[PDB]
Amino acid sequence: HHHHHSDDLTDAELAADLAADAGKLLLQVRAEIGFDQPWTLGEAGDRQANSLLLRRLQAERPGDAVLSEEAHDDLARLKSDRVWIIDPLDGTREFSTPGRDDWAVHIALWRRSSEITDAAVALPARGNVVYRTDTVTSPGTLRIAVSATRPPAVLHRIRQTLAIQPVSIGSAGAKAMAVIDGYVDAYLHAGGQWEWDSAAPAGVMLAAGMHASRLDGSPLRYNQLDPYLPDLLMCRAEVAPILLGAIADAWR
Ligand SMILES: Nc1ncnc2c1ncn2[C@@H]1O[C@H](COP(=O)(O)O)[C@@H](O)[C@H]1O
Ligand SMILES: [Mg+2]
Ligand SMILES: [Mg+2]
């Protein structure tokens, strides 16, 4: 009784519960199927996590649109004021590899403003820790998390002027949460990505009072017709001017 203000969860509570629940299911799938066929393992994780998440979002938020990596996109979301942007399993490659803990579940709520208002990132292999927008708290040399698979070429240019050690990690969620944790100073990506890769990490990053933008400094924009969103910078606030500047100076 008495809900929240303005099966009875706030949007942030639901984001966190969805992320944890999908996390537990993924851990079950990993234990059941095992690692002999990494392709089969990854496919099962993607498909089963997606199924759980879509079932629960229909049951618990039947009026909300959903954009998932693992489902067709009917574009009804473009007319909605409330859109869940989900990556049922981010870092499928890493999930499918024995002993790797750098994979995530991304659950973001986009709300139309006159933008990512609530979000959670689960790292199921790290004790199923769930970072959430409603509980997350607020220069000589830089540690920068980059893709273990497709690191951005632009890094090479900025390293001519800034002392940087790249830290190879799988998953956008894992790299963003390494920034929150203080394991790295920044997460930098370019060369391609999708909205569900960055929406929940961005929500958490901004809620923690940290920086999250495009490489050119402009805001990350979601619920776009084309959900391709190819580059990002997520970092401590104090680090953003240094990196955005170096990126800008790499141009000219
Ligand atoms: N160049 C790229 N184009 C499209 N998607 C990417 C690219 N690099 C990374 N991703 C996606 O971003 C997420 C994290 O990737 P990674 O940081 O490489 O583990 C995964 O969903 C990848 O498929
Ligand atoms: Mg995925
Ligand atoms: Mg992904």
Side-chain angles (χ1 to χ4, degrees):
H1 269 280
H2 271 287
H3 195 66
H4 51 80
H5 177 247
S6 74
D7 68 86
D8 202 9
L9 305 177
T10 67
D11 290 324
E13 287 171 341
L14 177 59
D17 198 65
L18 291 173
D21 195 15
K24 291 171 177 183
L25 175 57
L26 287 164
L27 293 166
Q28 297 170 9
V29 170
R30 224 181 184 204
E32 169 90 18
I33 295 186
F35 298 100
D36 299 314
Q37 291 180 344
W39 181 86
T40 300
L41 173 54
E43 283 283 281
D46 291 334
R47 171 185 54 87
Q48 294 187 45
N50 181 69
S51 288
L52 175 157
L53 291 170
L54 296 192
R55 161 177 63 81
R56 289 200 52 198
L57 281 166
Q58 179 63 30
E60 300 167 43
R61 292 294 189 271
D64 292 353
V66 182
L67 173 64
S68 170
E69 186 185 18
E70 305 299 333
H72 289 171
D73 174 17
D74 69 14
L75 297 176
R77 54 179 181 92
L78 296 182
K79 301 213 313 293
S80 179
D81 296 337
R82 294 175 48 98
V83 181
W84 295 88
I85 304 178
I86 65 174
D87 196 337
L89 168 55
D90 184 62
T92 298
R93 171 186 150 170
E94 285 77 17
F95 170 81
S96 306
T97 308
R100 298 294 295 279
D101 75 341
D102 43 346
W103 49 279
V105 182
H106 298 175
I107 308 296
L109 177 62
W110 177 93
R111 296 189 66 173
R112 192 179 301 273
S113 65
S114 308
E115 284 282 72
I116 303 303
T117 54
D118 307 273
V121 172
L123 306 181
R126 306 200 85 171
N128 210 28
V129 63
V130 180
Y131 296 81
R132 38 194 292 189
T133 47
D134 61 339
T135 70
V136 72
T137 42
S138 165
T141 198
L142 298 169
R143 289 169 52 80
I144 300 183
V146 298
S147 173
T149 306
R150 292 174 280 184
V154 65
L155 189 48
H156 176 87
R157 267 169 304 182
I158 66 170
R159 292 192 67 186
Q160 293 173 24
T161 70
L162 292 178
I164 288 159
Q165 294 180 32
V167 179
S168 301
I169 305 171
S171 164
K175 284 189 281 303
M177 299 305 99
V179 177
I180 303 277
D181 287 357
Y183 184 63
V184 297
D185 301 293
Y187 165 32
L188 196 148
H189 191 72
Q193 240 191 30
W194 300 90
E195 284 188 18
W196 44 78
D197 290 314
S198 62
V204 174
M205 193 73 38
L206 294 171
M210 293 187 186
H211 177 94
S213 72
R214 297 290 298 268
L215 286 183
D216 66 5
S218 64
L220 298 162
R221 299 280 317 285
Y222 294 96
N223 198 29
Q224 303 296 290
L225 169 59
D226 183 357
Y228 188 70
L229 206 173
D231 62 77
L232 66 88
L233 171 64
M234 296 183 185
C235 60
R236 301 189 279 104
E238 325 85 49
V239 164
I242 290 84
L243 280 175
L244 286 171
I247 296 164
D249 297 333
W251 283 87
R252 301 193 163 263

